[PDB]
């Protein structure tokens, strides 16, 4: 039955016109503490349907300050344990506001220091090289952001990285269903990016 | 002064005026940013040629700017041409360049009328990618309407946000190279003053028309805490009521968004103080000095660290402004 | 309960009662400390023998303690015998020991009367230097009147401040040796709770009689911010009005002294916070972690550093109190 | 005339029944900023009449945070310059509250650390050894404190060190005269310390 569930989720992801390589989960709801079991379900659903990377984000840093409780919940819902832990660590990133603007600033400090050390010229800094300095260096930008809650804002989520990201909004993550999550994927799959053309 | 061509308008109707007075009792946006999308789909919908859609889209910009003024919203930013749009067909790109040549150039001829109403026109982008003549028309309009205060239109042309952010870093890098900056002076606040939009507060609202739910490399830094409104209407069909709905969305978000914006700013200042205290501590345990003395050495060194930083920043900004003002055309 | 022999008193006269009501409208001291000086000069002045001066001096202590109670001043500390006084002649030292044997011992026999009025008697000093029998009488009186709340007399006997301070450090050193303390836990606040006087707030007033203008190794730590009053009167001649004058001196100093006391305490806490932040910073740049993270690592480590310190202190104090209570006699 | 002034001050100090080896100047006045020229005069007077050490103290740390201005003023009023500077540094200490209780705490921390390192026993700490740890280790305790201003308090001045110190009070240091200063010395010279006897 475990192999049956895996096959269904794989068929589901494979059936869509396209799947996000990298999905962001933005939790805006502040009235209630976030539900870690619901977030973990979303993350496991992404992995099960074929999405490579999932970033979990809240403007207050709640997830970043409860990283271990979130991983434990994610690992629990999947059911060598070391291999599963390493896999979750490679796929899941737990972000907070400092991962956006404050990290662009960190990259600019690093570059300016290289200018100060006569290693680089100001004209060396272009868009590509700025992205190389950006702490998300080896990772693809988020294709899809699922925003939960009533705030119509990205609330500081990876400003540099969401230049082309599709933003689908859901009212709440609190008792999220697989159908609600897959509906969002269907919406993303139907998007057409013309890239300026 | 009747009406300029960038452009003038009539007063609000009775129903529009009534609703305006109602929402003006609550928080109002000071700055709205528009992604003017859907011109071509609108042309296909109305069986008109693509150039007619873009020209109608310009008319709607002039109409929408009038609505904003009639609502007391005195700063507007619009996405008129993305760097990515250079990938469109020569026939369409030329049609857009010719429109810009025609709407600019009409800005002159309508001078004095812009000075009579204090209309500041700013054009933001990597403008060296535009045809030279269009650049000179742009520069004249920007130079003519500088020092105007009553309202502000920012036309993002040959613009992307990533190009803007990397230019802001380049400007700070030049500062370090020139000796006006130390690498440790780089900050979110300083980067903000190096953007093309550095004379504008961040948008209260970001509106994108047509059904697209993405930012498309527009004001990514500036709109991190902005109310985002995605409306299905095609841009040339924009109405006062679409604008009204967006302002309504902003008012419903305003209390949460304000608190989050305020909490973010307090947390950044808190962490900046922690970082500066740690710097002062490291310099103090290097050497033989202490950190908890009656002499208040830590506190004197913390004040000098921050004062020298602010002095170096003020000098860099002044030099940046002098370089930016320096222009043949 | 009429009157004990340590000792009881009549009510205030009309003029004393009137002036008392006047000064009780302003700040009143909660704790007064007396250096009872000039007994021998008084004996020579009255052509009485030295032992008669000291016995009269005890009578004045009982009278002065009654005045304090009638004024609502419920805690008094007195310098009855300094360690240095052991250098006096055997005839005089024995006379003082016999007085103490006689005034104690009369504390018993007057039990129940002490319990009826809630009189707590504490005797502070390096009491192992006193004759064994005097120690046992002292211990009985202290043990009997413990758990009494209405008023407090601290008799400093075979006491010096330097011996008290070094004992407080010894107690903290024992704490470290026992594993109840870390050396970094030692603090001004902790040292305070290791003094003989740790059940008393610091004196509001320190009074020394006769013309001497020095502290003579009395409550040096405790009186650093106390109003100091030096009065020429010889101790056996002390009157209500000398006491009144001293309280008046305290009221005139009170606003400045309070602010200075408060400014000192805020500055100590400020520097303690700076020191703890620097500790957390050093532990954080050791290893690879950072100090300005959204994870608030610095803030979690700062809270744990201070909570573990407070937990270790509370455990040490409880063990110190158990050791101090442990006494055959 | 310079040699004449020196001889007079020497005769003045030598004429007293006794002179303090170490004098403390406690400034309690907070309404006006302390007058550095007046403090410097007092210090020079002490040195001129034969007093070895002078400690300058205020509860706010004003003197400790203006150490150089005070030395400069002291050196000015004396009139190799290096020798005079070294002499003032050996005789003058500028103190603040941290030099009292906070330094007793520092000594107790140092001792407890030695207990922790098995180098010392708690019973090793006696009065003499505590004084050895006390940052005033090689210096004599203050014989005389001159307190200026209207506050009847030592305001945290060297609590451990003033066990036997004579405390003479003057209303103000603001235009202090040599006669007023010498009057205090005459008062100290007339004091009799019986040391418990
Ligand atoms: C300063 C000046 C004269 C500016 C020109 C006026 C103006 C409104 C320009 C915007 C042109 C544009 C790229 C619209 C985007 O909709 P679209 O073309 O992508 O339409 P679609 O999404 O339906 O294909
Ligand atoms: C608990 C108890 C029974 C205490 C005894 C009562 C009592 C008042 C003791 C104080 C004795 C004493 C050393 C007085 C100091 O004046 P002095 O002797 O130094 O006189 P002088 O300065 O004139 O020489
Ligand atoms: Mg479009
Ligand atoms: Mg005496």
Residue numbers in the entry:
A (entry chain B), D (entry chain B): 79 to 157, 176 to 293
B (entry chain A), C (entry chain A): -2 to 326
Question: What does the report in the manuscript say about this coordinate set?
Answer:
The human cis-prenyltransferase (hcis-PT) complex catalyzes the formation of dehydrodolichyl diphosphate (DHDD, C85–100), a long-chain isoprenoid, by chain elongation of farnesyl diphosphate (FPP, C15) via multiple condensations with IPP. DHDD is the precursor for dolichol-phosphate, the lipidic glycosyl carrier crucial for N-linked protein glycosylation. Localized to the endoplasmic reticulum, hcis-PT is composed of two structurally and functionally distinct subunit types. These include the catalytically active DHDD synthase (DHDDS) and the quiescent Nogo-B receptor (NgBR) subunits.
